[PDB]
Structure formats: C-alpha cells, structure tokens
C-alpha cells in the first residue's frame with residue numbers, strides 16, 4: 001500500500017480546504033474524489049443556484065421595475081438551455097482553478113470511490129492507501145420520501161440536470177433549498193407550487209422573516225401550500241405528475257422536486273471496519289478538534305454530528321484541522337457559534353444568531369429588547385411593485401448585546417458579513433449606534449433603529 | 451417685538467430638520483426656517499434623485515450588458531428620460547409629505563422664507579423678527595461655477611436634475627464623487643459622456659487601488675476620461691451645442707456641460723457680520739467639538755462647518771446630538787467625526803472607511819503597516835462577456851493589525867460596508883475579521899477571507 005502523511009476522503013468543500021492547507025505546510029496529501037472536484041457546492045449547490053438566482057433577478061428587473069424607470073422593453077423570450085451552458089461553463093473554470101491550486105500544492109488527486117479496509121487503510125480502484133491521519137469529508141445526498149410514485153420526482157441534482165424549463169413545478173420542502181428553487185423558478189416564468197408540511201416555510205427563522213417571505217410569495221411569488229403532507233405521486237396518462245396530499249387535495253404538474261432534507265453519505269464507505277462511532281442518522285461523532293473516537297480519523301462538513309450544513313463551515317473546519325495537525329497549533333479548532341446565513345430567496349434573507357423566541361427562552365422575555373425597521377427599498381419604491389424590507393436586532397441584557405440580527409429585502413444578502421464580525425466582537429446596540437450611517441442604502445436601516 | 455422661541459434652526463435641510471425634530475421631541479418650541487424646499491440638498495437635488503437614477507442606470511446595464519448571457523432575448527425599444535424624472539419627483543414628493551407629517555406631530559413651526567441675522571440672538575424673515583437663546587446655522591452649500599468666459603452656458607448639479615429630456619452628449623467637468631456619479635449614470639443610460647479632470651485622475655483622495663480600478667473600468671465600459679484638462683472657455687456655437695475649450699488646446703463639442711468642480715458654503719448674504727461669528731477664507735464657520743461658534747448661543751452643523759464632513763448622515767447626527775445636549779441635558783453628547791463610512795455611486799460603486807494605504811504609512815510608518823487585498827470577478831458578471839473586476843483592501847497598523855482602513859469597489863459593495871463600520875468603531879483587528887465565518891456565495895465574504 002502507498003503511504004501518505006494525510007488522506008482526505010471527499011474532494012468537496014471540506015476535503016479540498018483541508019488537503020490544500022495541509023500541503024502548504026509540507027504534507028504529502030492524497031485527495032480522493034469519485035465524481036467532480038468541489039462537491040455539492042461547486043457542482044450542484046451554491047454556485048449553480050446563485051447563477052440562476054442572478055438570472056431570475058434580471059427577469060424581475062425587466063418584468064417588474066424597468067417600465068417605471070422609463071424603459072420600453074420587450075422580453076421576447078428566455079432560453080433556459082443558454083443559461084445552463086453559461087452556468088456550466090463557469091463551473092468549468094472553477095474546476096481548472098482547483099486543478100491549478102491542487103497542482104501547485106503537490107496534492108495527489110485520485111479519481112475514484114474510497115472505502116475503508118481498516119482504521120488506517122482505504123481502498124480506491126483496487127489499490128490500498130494508508131496514512132497516519134485520515135479525513136472523512138464525504139458529505140450528503142438528497143432524501144427521497146418512501147411513498148408510492150416517489151421515483152417520479154427529482155431532487156436538487158436532477159433539477160440542475162434539467163436541459164429545459166419545465167412549464168409547471170411542484171417544489172416539496174420547507175427548508176432554504178426548496179424556497180430558493182421555488183423562487184428562482186417562479187421568477188423565470190414557471191408555474192410554481194411550494195408544498196410545506198406545516199404552517200409555513202423556514203420554520204427555524206424569525207417570525208418577521210417568515211411573515212414577510214409569505215406575504216411577498218402570495219403577491220408576486222410561487223403559490224404556497226401549507227399543511228401539505230405528500231401521500232402519493234400519480235403518473236397520469238398524459239405524462240404529468242399528480243401530487244396527492246394526505247389532507248385530500250392534489251396538484252397536477254410537469255416535474256416535482258423533493259427538497260425535504262439530506263442525509264450523510266456514511267453508509268457505503270465500510271465504516272464498520274474502522275471502529276468509528278456514528279449516531280442513529282449516520283452522522284459521525286467528533287470532539288471539538290474534529291477527531292472521531294478512533295485516533296487518526298477525523299471528520300468535517302455535512303456528515304459531522306452537530307455541524308452546520310454550509311460550505312464555509314466545512315472550509316474553516318478543514319483548514320483549522322490542517323493547522324492543528326501540520327502547523328503545530330494544538331488549540332486550532334472551529335467556532336460553530338454566530339455563523340451567518342443567507343438564503344437566496346425572492347427577496348433574499350440574511351440572519352445571524354438567535355430568533356426573537358430563541359432569545360426569550362435563553363434569557364427570559366423581560367430581559368430582551370427588540371428593535372425593528374420596516375421600509376421599502378428605494379430601488380422598488382419608485383415602481384408599481386412596492387416590495388417590503390424588514391430588519392430586526394434582538395438584544396439581551398442591560399447592555400443590549402445583539403444576540404440576533406435578521407433581514408429580508410433587496411441586497412440584504414450582501415450587508416450581513418460585516419455585522420457578523422461586530423457580533424463576533426460582542427457588539428451591543430450602543431456599538432451599532434456609534435457608527436455613522438451610509439445614505440442612501442438599505443444597510444443604514446440596521447444602524448438607525450430606535 | 452421679536453417672537454420668542456427656545457430654538458431657531460436656519461436651513462431646513464438634513465442638519466436643520468434632524469436637529470429641530472429632536473429638540474422638539476424634548477418639549478422645545480422650535481422655529482425651522484427654510485427659503486426653498488424642505489429636505490434641502492439631499493432630498494431634492496442630491497442623494498435621493500441621484501440614487502433613483504443610479505438604479506435606472508443599473509437596470510440599463512442589466513439589460514444591455516448581461517441579459518443575453520443569462521439567456522434572455524430582449525428588445526430595449528427605448529428609454530424615456532421624462533418618465534424617470536416623473537417617477538423620481540413623485541418619490542421625492544412622498545418624502546415631502548412625510549416631513550410635513552413628522553414636523554407637524556412635533557409642533558415645529560416651519561417658516562417659509564430667507565433668513566438674515568439681525569444680531570447675536572435675532573434673525574429676520576419676511577419682515578418679522580424671531581429671537582431665541584439657541585440658534586443653529588445649517589444653510590448648507592451651493593455649487594461652484596468657475597469664472598471663465600461662457601461659464602453661464604454650463605449647468606451644475608441642480609440644473610442636471612432640472613433636465614426633462616436626455617442630452618445626447620455631455621461634458622462633466624470635475625474630479626469629485628459628484629462628477630463621477632453623474633458621468634457614470636449618463637454613460638450607462640445611453641449618453642455620450644466625457645469626464646474632464648484637471649490632474650491625473652478623478653477621486654484623487656481615495657486609495658490608489660480604487661482609483662486604478664475605476665479608471666480601468668471607465669476606459670473599457672464607462673465614460674471617456676480626459677486628464678490634465680483645465681477649462682479655459684465655453685463657446686456657444688451657432689447650432690445650439692456647446693464647445694468646451696481647454697488650456698492645453700483640446701476641445702469637445704457637447705449638448706450640455708455640467709460643472710461639478712466643488713461646492714462653497716451659503717454663509718454670505720445672511721448678515722453674519724452682525725453676530726460676531728467668524729468664518730475662514732472659504733466661508734466655513736469654525737465650531738468647537740459641541741458645534742458651538744465663538745459666540746454663545748450660535749451653533750452650526752453640516753456642510754458649512756469648518757473641518758466637517760459633507761454627507762447627510764453627518765449633518766443629521768451632529769444636529770441630533772446637539773439637541774440631545776441642549777434640550778435633553780446631556781452635556782457630553784457630541785458628534786464623532788472619526789471612521790465615517792463613505793459610498794460613491796459610481797459604475798461600479800465604491801465603499802471606503804478610514805485611512806488610505808499612504809495615509810496609514812505617514813501616520814504609523816511604512817514598516818508598521820500591513821496591507822491585505824482581494825481581486826475577484828463578481829459571479830453576477832463572471833458568467834457574461836462583460837466581466838467586471840472587484841477589488842477590496844484592508845489597511846492594518848500595529849502588531850495587533852488594527853484595521854485602520856477598508857476599501858472596496860465592485861457590484862453591491864455599496865451595501866456591504868455599514869456592518870464593517872460597526873466593527874471598526876469597536877477597534878477591529880485582522881484577527882476579528884478572521885473570527886467570523888464567511889457567507890458563500892457573496893461578494894462580501896472577500897473582505898474576511900484575505901490572507
């Protein structure tokens with residue numbers, strides 16, 4: 001068996017981040033990837049989703065706002081396949097950047113599907129590879145419900161595989177993926193239906209964010225269907241699919257997307273040969289240093305128990321692990337607190353920290369203070385299509401530490417990173433008040449609340 | 451006899467309104483004197499109209515430059531400038547209704563007319579005298595028109611917003627942010643635009659990374675920049691068009707000429723010589739840290755302040771803190787002029803806070819500063835045939851690497867710096883920037899992933 005200082009299983013967000021970083025400090029690294037480098041994010045996640053989000057934003061601009069700004073515009077047509085080739089060409093340039101970076105760091109990239117043989121050895125393409133340190137970063141895959149006709153639906157992967165625009169779509173799920181896809185499809189001219197199992201989408205978000213997303217969907221977005229539990233998917237004689245709900249109602253569509261969750265891909269790598277512990281749902285257990293119960297085996301990214309399913313989390317966790325193992329920094333670790341999130345819905349959502357109710361449960365109702373700002377972005381205020389924007393700061397203690405920050409509206413996706421640094425430094429309402437506002441922008445509304 | 455008020459604010463702009471309202475919130479009987487339209491420069495002929503038209507320009511760029519690469523077959527049959535003016539002024543009108551409502555609920559007595567001082571404690575408007583123990587001068591500025599032949603054929607920022615039809619060709623004269631914004635808006639909206647600067651480049655007080663990037667983006671897809679261009683004369687040709695003549699011998703035939711060479715304060719013509727209040731060579735009023743002049747009871751905020759910052763939020767906060775001090779008995783309340791963030795709505799937009807690379811070298815010493823930078827293409831334009839560069843920089847000082855300067859230019863940069871402004875007020879170091887987890891995919895994550 002060939003020996004390496006470090007073996008990274010999975011060439012996704014975590015694997016690449018960790019493999020490069022460990023190589024920078026002179027390590028001989030083997031990076032094992034079965035499909036394409038960059039994993040879910042680069043190929044069938046963040047990147048392609050964003051490229052289409054931008055396209056959808058251009059549509060909204062021409063369809064909803066252009067006219068009122070004085071433009072006589074005629075959108076003659078939208079070619080979905082043209083968007084796809086631009087998207088995939090961009091994804092291609094990303095693949096060659098990685099091959100240049102990984103090449104310059106001497107990371108040995110091995111194309112194949114890795115399985116464990118034992119604690120210290122993995123097999124790929126019939127060959128055995130051994131190492132002192134082994135990172136498991138295989139990520140997840142979409143969860144397909146166990147009902148009749150489930151196989152007729154597609155998942156987020158199949159959606160990015162669509163060569164042409166479906167005429168009508170049922171998006172099933174309440175998480176950010178379902179909301180993002182449902183929003184992009186509607187903006188691009190597809191009859192879109194969003195089916196959520198209970199009262200609303202994004203149930204883990206602040207009520208202000210939920211309520212505004214809901215009202216904006218009702219007026220200019222996909223059609224929302226609450227209390228919708230799938231029962232069956234019937235393939236009709238004409239080729240369309242009919243989603244039957246447990247409540248008795250049904251909806252006919254051309255394509256149906258399952259966006260009901262993801263589960264870790266830890267069931268086919270022969271873990272039962274390593275002694276590595278996992279929880280009931282297949283997630284790998286780790287200490288604060290990304291190390292499993294078996295010394296020399298580590299884990300970062302989506303498959304980690306108590307992790308966060310974002311790309312920057314896996315990147316940072318992987319890099320900090322490489323700092324620890326190869327750059328003599330035993331305290332180097334990942335910080336999973338106050339990680340910012342952005343949902344590229346229509347309109348976009350930005351959030352950091354605790355919701356109004358989470359802060360009430362943690363600190364007590366009377367010990368928290370909430371500041372809000374409701375406004376119309378100037379961008380849409382001059383048009384027939386007024387869009388609301390809402391922002392909120394959730395404060396706790398007498399010092400009014402900003403324990404939660406929430407926003408929904410035009411360009412909110414871009415205004416959150418900086419407030420995240422401030423919150424990481426323990427910012428209080430007074431710290432927010434100490435800065436002079438930038439006029440005219442949407443971001444000043446975060447610092448002008450009283 | 452003179453009518454007595456607790457407070458008199460001369461000028462109903464950004465500083466005047468913010469201060470009058472705030473003082474009134476605490477029970478002060480206030481008189482707000484305004485000669486023209488409430489809201490002043492910002493609302494009527496500044497920030498607001500400028501931004502509305504910047505959005506129009508952004509929509510045009512989305513359709514002209516990016517639409518087809520995203521798959522859209524678009525026919526841009528025409529752009530109607532008058533419709534944009536109609537929408538822009540309709541919005542401004544709704545802002546005026548808000549101010550009438552708010553000033554109304556606070557019981558601020560709004561007086562329409564031009565105010566002149568009578569003495570230290572009294573001002574005259576429409577023949578009547580008004581007096582008070584506290585008087586705030588917040589008359590703002592006015593565009594500077596150069597004294598050269600045919601200068602009167604040119605217009606200024608005010609005249610630009612008075613245009614009811616799109617001019618075909620325009621010469622924007624100036625190197626400041628106003629010239630740059632107007633030139634970029636006109637170019638994107640379909641006007642042949644020529645920007646004339648007197649020296650090596652526009653925005654010469656900004657960091658070299660910001661200048662070099664704006665220059666290279668203009669050269670490729672923006673207005674046509676003319677360096678070392680000193681206006682000599684403006685000729686009114688027989689066909690109605692204007693020819694700009696430069697000292698170096700060059701010339702340019704255009705339809706409208708916009709002077710954006712600076713602004714001077716509107717402090718003359720209000721009889722200040724009767725108050726004892728001193729002004730510098732350029733007409734600015736000197737004040738202490740609490741906005742008070744050398745004459746007790748006379749204050750000043752906004753654009754006319756010596757050593758002040760000519761931005762609306764600066765006037766607004768300085769006016770608010772002055773009222774917190776005078777009418778809510780907070781003797782330590784004042785305005786903090788350090789680390790004020792700035793945004794220029796150029797194409798593409800610029801965001802900046804604190805010191806430039808060179809300013810940090812002069813203050814801390816070349817050897818004690820570290821510069822971090824990120825060069826990338828925003829995903830929005832990387833999928834197109836019109837790739838646009840984005841540049842960001844963090845200027846750090848000391849062994850702790852305190853971020854004393856932050857600079858950016860690129861798509862959406864305008865909205866990403868307010869938050870970093872909070873962090874820098876809290877004394878953020880490079881390690882504070884590193885301690886946050888990036889948001890992907892955004893342009894903003896580039897500020898926190900530098901190594």
Ligand SMILES: Cc1cc2nc3c(=O)[nH]c(=O)nc-3n(C[C@H](O)[C@H](O)[C@H](O)COP(=O)(O)OP(=O)(O)OC[C@H]3O[C@@H](n4cnc5c(N)ncnc54)[C@H](O)[C@@H]3O)c2cc1C
Pocket residue numbers: 009010011012013014015032033034035036037038039040041042044045046047049112113114115137138139140156177265268269300301302303308309310311312314890891
């Ligand atoms: C539709 C969608 C949109 C998303 N949008 C965003 C977003 O906007 N922002 C954001 O931060 N996050 C987003 N995410 C989440 C993000 O993509 C993941 O959290 C991130 O990719 C996790 O990285 P990872 O390294 O844990 O796994 P991955 O990046 O998925 O990497 C796993 C890799 O390992 C490979 N692999 C699996 N098994 C084996 C084996 N046995 N041998 C070798 N290789 C193997 C896979 O082919 C894959 O390349 C999105 C996810 C989805 C599904």
Ligand SMILES: Cc1cc2nc3c(=O)[nH]c(=O)nc-3n(C[C@H](O)[C@H](O)[C@H](O)COP(=O)(O)OP(=O)(O)OC[C@H]3O[C@@H](n4cnc5c(N)ncnc54)[C@H](O)[C@@H]3O)c2cc1C
Pocket residue numbers: 438439440460461462463464465466483484485486487488489490491492493495496497500563564565566588589590591607628716720751752753754759760761762763765
């Ligand atoms: C084209 C342009 C674009 C700009 N864009 C921005 C931007 O994007 N962001 C930003 O922050 N800033 C911007 N500014 C600057 C901003 O508008 C000013 O800094 C701000 O308005 C200053 O407020 P002020 O209270 O000092 O004076 P102003 O707001 O100008 O108000 C002064 C008021 O006093 C009145 N007045 C004058 N003399 C008298 C008198 N004798 N009696 C009674 N009333 C009188 C005037 O009519 C006026 O209403 C811009 C300026 C211009 C010219």
